[PDB]
Amino acid sequence: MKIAVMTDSTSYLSQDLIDKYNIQIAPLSVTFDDGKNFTESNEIAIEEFYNKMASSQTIPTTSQPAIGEWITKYEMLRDQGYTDIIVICLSSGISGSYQSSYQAGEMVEGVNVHAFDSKLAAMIEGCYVLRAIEMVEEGYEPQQIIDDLTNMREHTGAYLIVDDLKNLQKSGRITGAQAWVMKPVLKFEDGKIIPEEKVRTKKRAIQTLEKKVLDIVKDFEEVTLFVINGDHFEDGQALYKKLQDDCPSAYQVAYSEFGPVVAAHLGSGGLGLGYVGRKIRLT
Numbered sequence: 001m002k003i004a005v006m007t008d009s010t011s012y013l014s015q016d017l018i019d020k021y022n023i024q025i026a027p028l029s030v031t032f033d034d035g036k037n038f039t040e041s042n043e044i045a046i047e048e049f050y051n052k053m054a055s056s057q058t059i060p061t062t063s064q065p066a067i068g069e070w071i072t073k074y075e076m077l078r079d080q081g082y083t084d085i086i087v088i089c090l091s092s093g094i095s096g097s098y099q100s101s102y103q104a105g106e107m108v109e110g111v112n113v114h115a116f117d118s119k120l121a122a123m124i125e126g127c128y129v130l131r132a133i134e135m136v137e138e139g140y141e142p143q144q145i146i147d148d149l150t151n152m153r154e155h156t157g158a159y160l161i162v163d164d165l166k167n168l169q170k171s172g173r174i175t176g177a178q179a180w181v182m183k184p185v186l187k188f189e190d191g192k193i194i195p196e197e198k199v200r201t202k203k204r205a206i207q208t209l210e211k212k213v214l215d216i217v218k219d220f221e222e223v224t225l226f227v228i229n230g231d232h233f234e235d236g237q238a239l240y241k242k243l244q245d246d247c248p249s250a251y252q253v254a255y256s257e258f259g260p261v262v263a264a265h266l267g268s269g270g271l272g273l274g275y276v277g278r279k280i281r282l283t
């Protein structure tokens with residue numbers, strides 16, 4: 001038994017971790033209104049993406065990995081001698097990437113695929129990859145890893161804000177906000193993005209993100225927090241610095257950013273605060 005762990009590009013793992021653990025990536029893509037298509041990778045300079053998105057009369061659209069891209073990746077890992085593949089996917093609530101990876105796993109011969117619906121995105125999704133790789137090294141079997149990740153998902157969540165709900169509304173990735181067709185605070189709930197509160201200022205929304213999350217993770221035996229920032233540098237920097245001041249060092253507090261595919265749906269000003277009830281290995 002040789003177990004591989006792979007994921008899609010929206011887990012936004014650093015190239016260092018991808019290189020070190022040889023993590024295969026099924027990439028998602030972005031398509032701009034001038035017909036220019038782009039595949040997600042760390043090669044992309046993210047400020048260049050925000051610039052083109054701001055200079056687009058029409059919001060760009062995104063694509064999940066086609067089912068054939070999952071298949072090709074599964075066959076490559078099988079043909080390298082892997083018998084089992086753990087697949088960490090973007091939330092099934094916002095993308096078909098998981099169901100495609102699931103269906104692709106049924107269709108590929110000679111290797112066992114264990115697709116996992118992270119029910120989130122970005123480096124919070126990435127944390128499931130890093131937990132899976134850690135357990136593989138420790139000798140666990142695929143069902144034990146899927147069981148552990150499922151328990152991890154019960155103590156994992158995220159809150160977030162955006163400058164303008166237009167991008168989420170255009171793509172249909174905000175649920176239950178038909179009345180809004182003030183500053184909204186959103187959260188993930190069973191893999192979908194819903195409104196949580198509405199505050200008067202952006203600064204109060206950022207303080208609200210911290211309070212919501214700290215109130216939750218206070219009861220966890222292990223805590224990892226991720227500040228995941230968009231195109232406004234000082235917003236993520238302000239939240240990250242304040243968390244380092246307000247949290248004990250027993251909390252793991254990390255920083256990351258949104259890639260093009262997620263940025264296309266949030267628009268400018270996206271800022272997330274995510275939590276995992278585990279001490280995830282980030283090295």
Ligand SMILES: CC[C@H](C)CCCCCCCCCCCCC(=O)O
Nearest residue numbers: 062063064095121158160265272274
């Ligand atoms: C701290 C964690 C953060 C709060 C996470 C925020 C994630 C926001 C996701 C926006 C929606 C992306 C849909 C991509 C669909 C891709 C497709 O299938 O086309």
